[PDB]
Each structure stands twice: as C-alpha cells, then as structure tokens.
C-alpha cells in the first residue's frame, strides 16, 4: 500500500496473510486474502499459478504483522487450493485472477471467530456500489515502488471506484480493461495498493454492510496518474465460487 495508514488485524478481521515454505526452511510471504466462511479464503490465482502445490502454503489469519506472531492468531493448512481455470496474462490484463483455498488447522478444524477473527460478506448477483464511492484496501505490500521489502504492519488506505468508461479511456487502460474487472484509484493519484497486495480486498460499504467488492489483480506500476489499481469484480464470480465451495 503506498501511502494511506498502518492499522491491526482487529480493523480488518476478514484479512488473511499467505506464505509460501522454502525447499530449505524459511517462509515468505506470497499474497493476502479474504476470509469468506469458517473453511474458505478468497484470493487471486496469479499468486499461486506457478507453484500450485497445496502443501507448501501456510495461512494466518488474526495476524497484523509481517514477521511476528500477533495475540490471538490461528495458522492453518491448505486442504485443497482451487485456480480458476480460465486465468490467464496479457500484455498487461490479468483475467479471471480469483482463487479459493480450503483451510484447516492441524486438528483438522476451520476457523473459530474472534474479534480479531470474521467473515466478509459476498455481494449479491450483479449488484455493485455506484461509481465515485469510497473502498478501502488492505495489506502488507510494497509502500514505494523502489523498495524491495514489505512493511512489517499491515497497512491500508482508502481509493475511489471508476467507471468501466473513464478507465477504458486511450490514456487509461484502454480495451484491456472488461467488465470483470473494477478500477479504483485516489483522485490525487497519491494512494494505492502495490505489488504484495495481490489477492487482498478491496472493500466497500453496499447498504449499510461491508461487502468484498474486489481482490486486488494488476495495474501499471503504483499510485501513477491515469493508471488506477484494476480488481477482479467479486459479483460476475459469483456461479463459480458457489461451485467451487460447496462438496
Ligand atoms: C510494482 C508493480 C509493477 C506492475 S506492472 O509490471 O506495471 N503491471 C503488471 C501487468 O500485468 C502487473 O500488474 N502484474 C501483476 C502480477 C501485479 O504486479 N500485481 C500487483 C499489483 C497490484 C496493484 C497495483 C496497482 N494498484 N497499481 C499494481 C500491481
């Protein structure tokens, strides 16, 4: 996240942390996500696709740093970690970036909650927030674009929903951008979600109710003007994740 605030699991409950074990011992950090039920995290299948080994994922969830244990954190294994088939990567495009991971604890159980510790509800058929509302956006990401680490707590920050057209404007996106996909940006191009963000939410008021609207895919470079954060659009994936997580 380049600029916005740091803040602590207990204001993003639903946020997951994912890591990868190394063929030696240590773990890094692969992507974040979003805790949709007791057993299933919503992510973005760009983060795994290359390693589609369930085994070698570990996810927290209650935890607000990077590289320390956080009171009254929960590890879990992955039970079955589901890519969409479709993904796939143009020029700069990433489409049908969305994936599903079963989780489960060493006792065999799914997530107990907390108050550090919740589900995010899924929005409806069709039915996302007007363009210009206000989402926020979570995660443990690149702060500047040239560094090279992650910050060590978690951050967040607040961006704005564009229209399907202002975004597929020529000096936009143009065409790459589908109707799959949501773009969000600070109006002064100075906040925005960055590499290691992937597979977070982006999150929104709907009526009322915090509704996980989008999980962060790609953009061009970070917080660069004319060049918003582009989403995987949680609601057209609705048939798929109902599929995906019911036996
Ligand atoms: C430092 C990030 C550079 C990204 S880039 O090379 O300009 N664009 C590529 C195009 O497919 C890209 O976005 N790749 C994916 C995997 C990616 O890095 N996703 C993370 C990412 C998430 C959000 C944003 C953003 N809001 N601008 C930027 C990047």
């Known amino acids: 996240i380049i600029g916005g605030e740091f803040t602590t699991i207990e204001n993003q409950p639903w946020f997951a942390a994912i890591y990868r074990r190394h063929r030696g011992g240590s773990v890094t950090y692969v992507c974040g996500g ?11 299948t760009h983060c795994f696709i290359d390693y589609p080994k369930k085994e070698d994922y570990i996810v927290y969830l209650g935890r607000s740093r990077l590289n320390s244990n956080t009171q009254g954190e929960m590890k879990f294994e992955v039970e079955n970690l589901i890519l969409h088939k479709d993904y796939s990567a143009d020029t700069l495009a990433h489409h049908n970036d969305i994936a599903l991971l079963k989780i489960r604890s060493k006792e065999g159980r799914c997530a107990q909650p907390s108050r550090t510790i919740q589900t995010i509800s899924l929005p409806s058929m069709y039915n996302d927030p007007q363009f ?12 500047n674009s040239t560094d090279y680490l992650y910050p060590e707590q978690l951050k967040m920050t607040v961006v704005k929903l564009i229209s399907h057209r202002e975004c597929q ?19 002064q191009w100075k906040t925005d979600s960055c590499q290691g963000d992937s597979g977070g939410p982006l999150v929104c008021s709907l009526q009322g109710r915090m509704t996980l609207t989008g999980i962060v895919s790609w953009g061009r470079g970070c917080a660069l003007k004319d060049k918003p954060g582009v989403y995987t659009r949680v609601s057209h994936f609705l048939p798929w994740i109902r599929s995906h997580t019911k036996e």
């Open 169 to 187: 404007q020529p000096h936009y996106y143009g065409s790459e951008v589908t109707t799959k996909m949501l773009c969000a940006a600070d109006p």
């Open 34 to 44: 979003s805790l949709i039920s007791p057993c299933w995290v919503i992510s973005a």
């Open 132 to 143: 210009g509302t206000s989402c926020e956006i979570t995660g443990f990401g690149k702060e």
